[PDB]
Amino acid sequence: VDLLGRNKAADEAAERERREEEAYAAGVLDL
Amino acid sequence: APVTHIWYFKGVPSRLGYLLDLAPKDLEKIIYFAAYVITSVDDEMRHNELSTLEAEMAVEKKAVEDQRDADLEARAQKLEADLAELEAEGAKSDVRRKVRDSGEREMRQLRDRAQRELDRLDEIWNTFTKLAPKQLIVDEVLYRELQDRYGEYFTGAMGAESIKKLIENFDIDAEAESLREVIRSGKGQKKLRAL
């Protein structure tokens, strides 16, 4: 984990999808 | 000259892209006169002709490739003459191999423009046979090279007029139901995009 580390792009896209998945389950108007 | 409304093009979501299932860059190209799109074509008219259009393409290609092999062999005999007339007199073989490398370059470039024309015509055919509207063309050459041969089969344009014609030539309840179905069945981010 210290030679490979952690990217940024993938994490951004992932938390994005996660946000729009926790927002569609209840109510989706996030902006 | 017709023109569109930025409010429904630039602001996210771009309503036009969503209505038509596009990306903006494509559309900012089609409206600011960069790429071309296909307003409509005929699928049943292009059905009973694919065979003979292949026939004409293939006869043209056999023609040019017969000329291509003729190029190869004729340049090769000229090269043999060049060597035989370069050695009969009193010169080293260093200069002979240099001039023969030049002649090799010659035959190479001949066969090269040859095969370049091959690949061009072949990709052109492969683009004709694979035609559905809303396709972009960043080329301006492929497009013209299709407008001269069979252009009258399909219909093309660019600008506000292209999107206009298209919108007119676009079923809506079919898309709406297919979208309801992609949402029902599909899942993931794809579900969200269809939503």
Side-chain angles (χ1 to χ4, degrees), chain A, chain B residues 1-77 79-85 87-107 109-195:
Chain A
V1 295
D2 291 305
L3 313 178
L4 302 167
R6 177 73 274 173
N7 216 359
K8 294 184 286 186
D11 306 354
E12 293 163 357
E15 70 153 2
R16 200 83 52 71
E17 296 180 13
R18 186 215 65 84
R19 283 178 153 291
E20 298 168 2
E21 179 54 57
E22 61 83 20
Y24 163 86
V28 71
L29 63 85
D30 64 348
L31 290 164
Chain B
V3 62
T4 68
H5 199 327
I6 177 167
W7 280 32
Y8 314 79
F9 167 79
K10 160 61 182 309
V12 71
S14 55
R15 274 66 196 200
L16 284 156
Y18 284 58
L19 183 72
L20 303 168
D21 183 28
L22 272 52
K25 57 184 212 305
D26 303 348
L27 194 60
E28 66 89 20
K29 270 171 53 48
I30 304 147
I31 65 172
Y32 293 118
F33 291 115
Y36 301 1
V37 295
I38 296 90
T39 71
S40 314
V41 74
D42 192 332
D43 53 338
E44 63 81 14
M45 186 295 301
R46 204 200 64 92
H47 181 75
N48 62 50
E49 297 213 286
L50 62 92
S51 177
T52 315
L53 274 290
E54 302 144 20
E56 309 315 327
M57 278 272 196
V59 297
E60 291 138 30
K61 297 152 174 175
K62 257 196 73 157
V64 289
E65 63 86 18
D66 280 88
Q67 303 338 301
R68 178 172 295 102
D69 298 67
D71 183 318
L72 286 191
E73 72 186 300
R75 187 74 252 188
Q77 73 154 90
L79 291 151
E80 183 64 26
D82 187 359
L83 197 49
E85 72 204 350
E87 62 164 278
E89 71 287 355
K92 296 155 262 297
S93 190
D94 272 298
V95 72
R96 290 203 259 296
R97 284 322 319 177
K98 276 291 269 165
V99 65
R100 289 311 317 283
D101 193 298
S102 179
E104 183 179 0
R105 168 265 311 267
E106 271 162 281
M107 60 180 280
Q109 59 181 11
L110 276 158
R111 69 146 67 79
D112 284 331
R113 65 196 58 109
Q115 58 152 90
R116 168 182 61 185
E117 195 283 330
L118 288 177
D119 293 331
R120 277 205 266 92
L121 203 72
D122 303 319
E123 191 273 333
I124 297 297
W125 169 251
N126 191 359
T127 53
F128 166 47
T129 302
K130 274 59 157 205
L131 185 63
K134 276 187 284 171
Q135 286 181 333
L136 301 88
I137 296 160
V138 183
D139 291 331
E140 185 179 1
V141 185
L142 190 154
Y143 175 69
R144 280 189 282 84
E145 300 262 338
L146 292 181
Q147 215 182 30
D148 54 349
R149 302 185 230 284
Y150 61 75
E152 76 287 8
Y153 295 0
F154 82 89
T155 309
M158 85 182 308
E161 311 183 13
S162 65
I163 313 299
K164 193 165 170 218
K165 300 176 64 53
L166 192 154
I167 295 163
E168 178 34 57
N169 310 330
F170 170 45
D171 187 9
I172 192 165
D173 207 352
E175 207 197 49
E177 282 307 323
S178 304
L179 277 169
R180 310 242 174 187
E181 200 61 7
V182 171
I183 304 162
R184 181 39 170 291
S185 304
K187 53 199 80 176
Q189 183 180 4
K190 185 176 180 181
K191 186 157 176 187
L192 280 194
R193 283 286 189 64
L195 211 64

